Structure formats: structure tokens, C-alpha cells
Design a protein around this ligand. Sequence first.
Ligand code: NA
Ligand code: NA
Lengths: 248, 248
Amino acid sequence: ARKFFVGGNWKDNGTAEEVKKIVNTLNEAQVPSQDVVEVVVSPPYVFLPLVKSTLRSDFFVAAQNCWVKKGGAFTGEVSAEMLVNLDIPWVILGHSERRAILNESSEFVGDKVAYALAQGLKVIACVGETLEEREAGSTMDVVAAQTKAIADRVTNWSNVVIAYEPVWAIGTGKVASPAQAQEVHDELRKWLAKNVSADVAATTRIIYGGSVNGGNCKELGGQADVDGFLVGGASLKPEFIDIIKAAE
Amino acid sequence: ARKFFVGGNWKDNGTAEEVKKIVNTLNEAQVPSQDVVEVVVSPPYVFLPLVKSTLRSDFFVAAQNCWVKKGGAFTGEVSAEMLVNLDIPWVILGHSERRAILNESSEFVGDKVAYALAQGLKVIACVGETLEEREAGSTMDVVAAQTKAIADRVTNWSNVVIAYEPVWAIGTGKVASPAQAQEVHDELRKWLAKNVSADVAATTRIIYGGSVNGGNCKELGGQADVDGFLVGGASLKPEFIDIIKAAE
Ligand code: NA
Ligand code: NA
């Protein structure tokens, strides 16, 4: 069985005092065993050492991005080998905000995934379609093309988790049902089975990166092809613990 | 007189052990007084708290970039208000690598400068032309356009330092003379006098961001319109101290 996976993307949020309170609340949390849930939290770069040094050892830390290749003459970027030096085990790559606002192409994201895995990082690789893409009938064309650019560059999927972001439901007045989430996760898994292998399809976690809260987390988590969540704003709040508890 | 200014851009370099050795070497350095040189060092984001907590109090810390506007839903970015929370006083904006490789436009850089200054950061704003631009006769057209996009958005220059990067001499086999540096710095200062004010032209440091080493730092620093340096790779090395000593 695929181990349920809950990632918390803090995005570009936090002060030293807020980070201490978030970490304390996570450290005091009582959640399902390590055997049935894997928990990753993702602070901004400036808080990676602080969170790694203070967070309970059974929760894991992710960076929110990294650079595409070996560091040295890229002002402002953080290399995969720098994250490995700091003992940060995970990285989020291809988040919808970076694809749309910073124009990260599918091939650029795929090159980042390959380089991060080569350096020993575990990767949350994000895919997802816009409302214009969904309304054009292009959901699976887009999600397959994004996934293919990663798959063409990945020789081992053990340390990859795919996150589906329903960008079409993010600030549009459109809402995604559990059935709509399940349909995309099923079709993406079927794509992996045909384009990579049956074994990779069966073993790769595909997590939901839409609106997740205490209200909806059990119905979403219980879908056949949903293996957990990439949480946004609730990741800063005690509600994140209720979302982890969907693994029960 | 304009106070000589030496910035060290570490770029995407460093391990925890290397950072400790760099900071120790800076802490043991014996350099000109605070009255005649201002020293700023710029680690990667993940080392900002470590360097700020351990560096001598008379040297200052810069981030290598920040986001264009208020933080909250920009995965992977670091906001100006986050740097202010961490008591990081400086930021480098518009570095040539970000303009060229990450396609930061002149207007985007100008919006970043304005937002950083509004939040209370001090800014090293970078400009510079490529070899193709220089060979087309476009040096001052390019440098003026880059500067204008910042000037159009800046209402106070007290906390701005401009860095000129001779991108045309960076990995091309072309070399920049002290006379060539002086010519651009003079023409840029003359542009500031006409387009902003005589007072801003007279008081704004314009630092040289080309190849700076112990060999060339005194001849470059002694040019009439060169007010210091934005150092690249030497910033990681004990040679950075020899470059600071050009202020004598
Ligand atoms: Na499920
Ligand atoms: Na000078």
C-alpha cells in the first residue's frame, strides 16, 4: 500500500517568532504512526536551518525550490547540493506559482527534478492546469505534458511524489469536488502505468494540492488514487494537524 | 566625500563549514576605519541568519535578491519584510545573472528596488551591458535605460548604491581597463545629475562590479567616479580583505 503523505507548503510566509510557534505546535502534535503517514513541512529558505534544528525528528523538512544545476555563478539561487549540506531531505519543484508567475517551463522543471534526485534529494514534483486549459478540454493534455517532461528525465521514481494542483479552482469561484480530484489522479496514474511502468504507477504517491481543510480532508484522502495532500495556508496553522490525521 | 563601499557577492556558494571559516577570516581582518569604508557581505538565503548572528557588527549583511511585492502566495521567494524581520539591512537587486538567466526585466528590477526601499532595506542596484550591446555602440543607451527604470520608481536615493557590471568582459576574452570603468561610471553619474539631481549624482556611490582582485583594486578605486566594488568569487577568499584595503 502507498504510505499517505502530507506536505505543508508555508510559501513566502514567516517571522522567527511565528516559525518558533509553528514548530512548537508541530512538536506537541499527536498524529498517526510513521508506518501510515509521512509528514513534510516546507519553510522559506531563510528558516530551513532553524526548522531542521528544532523540528521533531519524525517530521521532515523541504525547500520550496532549488536551482537547475551545479551552483557557482547564479546570484540569488540555492543549489541542491547546498540543501544536502544542510541535511534538508526534500524539495518542492514546479509549483504552479513558479510555472505561472516566474515562467518555469515544463522542461526546466524536469531538469530541476533530475538534478535534485541526482544530488540525493527527495522531490515533490507539481503539475496542474489553469481554468482556461480545463475549459478548453485540455486537463489531461496539460497534466500529461508536464508529467512527461519530468518522466523523460527521471530514471528512478522511488524518491518522487507527484502533486496535482487544480489551478483552475484557485481564486476563480470554481470549486473542485472529491470526484473531480479522483478523476485527475486516476487518469494521471493510468498515464504513468502506460508511459513508465505498472510498478511505478502502483507505488508512486499522487497527492492533492487543491483546497484542503479539516472539513474535506477525510473524503479527499479516502479517494482511491489520492495519496495525501500538498497543503497551502493551513500548513501555518494548527489545522495542519487535523489534515495529517486524515491518514487514520 | 562619498564613503568607499565594498560588497561581497558570495553567489550560490557555501557549506556551513565554509561559511564559519569565511566569517572567522572576516572577524579577524584589520581594515580601514568605518569612517572611510562600508563593507557588506552577501551569503545565500539559507546562511543569512548564521552570518548575521556571527559576523563582526561593523560589517553588514545583504541578501542576493528579494521578491517584488508583499509576500504570501509566492512559493520559493523571500520577501523584503522577511529580510527586515531577520535584521538583514541590505539587498542586491538586478544582478546581471538574474537579468540574463532568469529574465528579470528592467521594470521588474525597478519595482523590486522601490518595494525593498519602502520596507526599509538598503539596495545595491545592478546595471550593465553585454558584449553584443557594447559592440553595437549601445553601452550608455542600455545602462541609462536600466537606471531610468529604477529612477522612475525611486523617490529617495540615500539608501541606494549603484553597481556597474561590465558583463561584456565576463567570460568573453575581453578585458576592461580602469579607464573603461571610469568612462561608464562618469557617464552614468552625469546621467543621474541631469535626470535626477546634481545632489543625487554627487552623493550616490557607483561601485564597479567587474573583475576585482588585489592586483587592480587600488587603480580602480582611485578613479574619480568609482566608489568601490561589488566583488564576485574573491568575496569567498581572504583576498576580499585586500580589496577592502583599497579604501586606504
Ligand atoms: Na486514498
Ligand atoms: Na574613487
